[PDB]
């Protein structure tokens with residue numbers, strides 16, 4: 057452990073953490089330096105696993121994950137106060153929140169060139185994970201899981217493949233929340249999603265079927281029919297550009313119906329907090345670096361997307377059969393809808409183990425409830441979180457914790 | 470106005486109502502006597518319309534409507550306290566909550582034979598509405614709307630047809646919330662609903678397609694394929710009989726995962742309240758009558774369903790073109806899912822007026838939001854309430870009030 061990176065007193069806490077936590081920089085490729093925030097397991101660090109968490113974007117910060125999803129403490133609406141999180145993932149794991157790629161959040165490079173791409177980012181994360189274990193050698197033995205969300209449906213499998221090549225790293229599994237595994241399945245499934253969740257109506261549905269579909273197999277992905285395109289554009293406008301919350305359809309869109317924030321998202325609370333000069337100091341951030349933003353428009357706009365499907369990477373990770381894989385999805389998200397990933401998993405053709413069923417969670421007074429549905433295959437499970445959006449741990453923390461706990465512990469869901 | 474039916478001091482109110490309200494009995498057919506609860510418009514009774522509200526079941530009470538959906542006051546969880554409702558429908562209307570048919574709630578008949586059927590109930594309500602105006606002659610001029618929910622998708626159109634025949638009654642329109650307009654469309658649409666909301670998965674979806682469907686149409690209603698039946702039964706089990714809240718898919722099921730209550734519904738609050746002997750007295754209920762239940766198992770079990778589709782009744786009501794009709798649906802309800810009714814309306818073939826679009830509601834701080842989608846035809850509109858279940862005014866009162874206000878006032882939604 058690099059002592060100088062230790063986080064001493066973090067502004068906004070009434071009482072200090074019972075666990076150690078560190079914040080500093082990992083070396084990536086070239087002259088890139090990625091900001092990390094490591095929170096030790098609240099219960100026996102030396103024998104709790106090591107979890108990497110990556111938020112997607114591309115261009116968005118993994119400190120959102122910490123501060124608004126499943127960190128030990130969550131920033132409150134005043135931008136100043138932090139409250140502990142009873143459902144935090146670091147209750148049972150050492151969680152490494154990594155701001156990546158170069159330029160996102162407090163991460164930078166010496167040359168400040170932040171245009172990048174999937175292969176470069178993968179390599180960058182891999183090298184940063186390497187640099188991590190040089191700094192934290194006592195955690196080289198721990199079980200190592202790679203977890204992410206959103207565009208990290210690309211970051212994580214591509215990374216995992218590189219990790220798979222290094223047997224010094226003790227990779228045990230990976231989990232992806234509302235991930236982007238395949239553009240084609242995501243795009244085709246979203247359109248069905250839109251109709252059957254009441255956004256489209258029959259004239260538009262008919263047109264779509266007519267122009268984009270022959271004999272009950274649709275192309276809403278890369279269809280060249282010009283009448284299909286005109287309708288896909290309409291769908292795109294309804295879903296993404298007309299007042300709905302794309303991250304969570306049943307939630308209001310932050311700030312009425314109309315720097316890069318994610319859409320329908322208020323990022324004030326977290327930004328206010330992390331730009332506090334005393335917070336930057338507590339987190340060993342060098343002063344000269346620009347303000348913190350949840351996402352970087354530059355990164356996102358300059359980002360070159362190369363992989364069109366994670367089918368290879370997942371089969372390549374499944375072939376070895378050392379690795380336990382989970383894809384979970386909020387079933388009211390339209391950014392990466394649950395069905396797209398259910399199709400993606402089903403089309404991996406693995407040996408079915410447990411048939412598709414409910415899975416439960418115990419609530420105070422409410423008793424047991426259905427938290428979602430789960431379909432298990434050999435080493436790979438698909439699972440939904442009923443009534444949760446793009447950011448599962450925010451919408452349904454308890455269900456998210458349960459899922460995660462049962463994942464870490466090789467247990468049935 | 471029958472003075473003796475006036476409600477004087479209603480237990481559970483801190484301060485007495487500014488509006489008059491009456492509770493007593495209307496004569497139906499034979500020896501049947503239906504309990505009513507009439508709440509005068511809070512704003513100018515003499516020029517506010519007359520609204521009939523019927524809950525469905527069959528066998529369930531319209532006092533649920535009053536006390537838990539859109540009455541001037543709603544019973545609170547202690548079963549004792551009533552709190553005023555700022556979104557109450559009697560803000561702008563004279564709402565007549567009618568317990569029907571004979572045997573439901575405080576309604577009875579001298580002979581106590583409560584087996585009945587759609588044609589008899591229609592006639593019974595019609596005659597009770599007649600008896601109403603004998604008792605309340607000063608309301609014969611007022612605009613008269615017929616509104617209901619649930620099985621009242623049958624009660625209301627069938628009633629309306631009888632009302633249509635009597636020009637002494639000033640019928641101006643009717644509205645149905647998550648109504649049962651057609652068993653076939655309800656049933657076929659529910660199955661798509663189930664798959665695309667993540668409850669079914671692909672093995673079961675494939676089977677269903679294979680056995681219940683040939684190329685561009687499914688029969689999930691009355692299909693005779695024995696392999697189709699086995700799968701429809703599985704769907705029926707998942708949707709209705711396995712822990713989900715059929716009234717609202719994203720809500721917990723009241724009282725864990727396994728007198729007739731509705732399923733997943735806690736009826737304690739209202740029952741506790743209405744069985745209070747002082748409440749019965751205040752509401753001029755004769756003592757000898759049995760306890761109040763939100764639904765009557767006898768009624769429901771002995772009930773004979775005759776109409777299989779309201780297509781005739783609606784066209785018959787639309788032909789005249791004196792009548793303004795609304796069908797609205799919560800889009801997360803599985804009892805009477807929104808699509809079934811959207812299909813039902815679309816298949817009425819009326820002259821399209823306004824194309825399908827969003828409709829908005831203003832919230833405190835949140836600004837304008839999308840409350841749902843609306844598709845207008847001449848004299849008949851279909852409209853959804855996004856994120857609302859089977860009981861719209863409970864899940865989304867403000868949206869429900871707005872909708873209703875805009876309906877009463879012949880205004881665009």
Ligand SMILES: *[C@@H]1O[C@H](CO)[C@@H](O[C@@H]2O[C@H](CO)[C@@H](O[C@@H]3O[C@H](CO)[C@@H](O)[C@H](O[C@H]4O[C@H](CO)[C@@H](O)[C@H](O)[C@@H]4O)[C@@H]3O)[C@H](O)[C@H]2NC(C)=O)[C@H](O[C@@H]2O[C@@H](C)[C@@H](O)[C@@H](O)[C@@H]2O)[C@H]1NC(C)=O
Nearest residue numbers: 498499584585586587588589590591592772773774775776
């Ligand atoms: C939905 O429910 C309504 C109301 O109950 C039914 O209408 C009623 O049908 C019943 C019998 O089904 C009729 O009962 C009759 O009452 C009259 C009184 O004047 C008598 O003429 C008659 O008594 C003779 O017949 C009895 C048996 O048939 C004998 O045992 C007696 O001794 C005596 O000889 C009998 O008691 C009601 O008159 C009738 N009411 C109304 C308002 O119509 C619906 O029944 C349908 O419509 C009816 C006209 C008739 O065609 C029924 O067969 C139909 O089913 C009922 N609908 C359905 C689909 O069940």
Ligand SMILES: *[C@@H]1O[C@H](CO)[C@@H](O[C@@H]2O[C@H](CO)[C@@H](O[C@@H]3O[C@H](CO)[C@@H](O)[C@H](O)[C@@H]3O)[C@H](O)[C@H]2NC(C)=O)[C@H](O[C@@H]2O[C@@H](C)[C@@H](O)[C@@H](O)[C@@H]2O)[C@H]1NC(C)=O
Nearest residue numbers: 085086169171172173174175176177179180360361362363
């Ligand atoms: C994705 O991003 C990576 C990293 O930026 C790109 O690879 C890099 O491309 C550079 C410029 O094309 C390469 O620079 C060369 O370096 C040598 C010195 O060793 C110079 O003498 C030479 O003049 C170039 O400047 C760089 O080597 C390369 N880096 C790595 C780690 O491979 C990548 O570009 C694509 O692949 C590489 C291998 C090249 O062949 C490019 O032509 C090609 O576009 C980016 N991927 C895409 C699809 O754009």
Ligand SMILES: *[C@@H]1O[C@H](CO)[C@@H](O)[C@H](O)[C@H]1NC(C)=O
Nearest residue numbers: 133134135310311322324325
């Ligand atoms: C965003 O959050 C801040 C801090 O929580 C709050 O004061 C503000 O009202 C929010 N802004 C909008 C546009 O909703």
Ligand SMILES: *[C@@H]1O[C@H](CO)[C@@H](O)[C@H](O)[C@H]1NC(C)=O
Nearest residue numbers: 546547548723724735737738
């Ligand atoms: C039903 O409501 C009553 C009072 O409103 C309450 O005492 C009881 O615990 C409730 N049951 C459930 C399962 O919520």
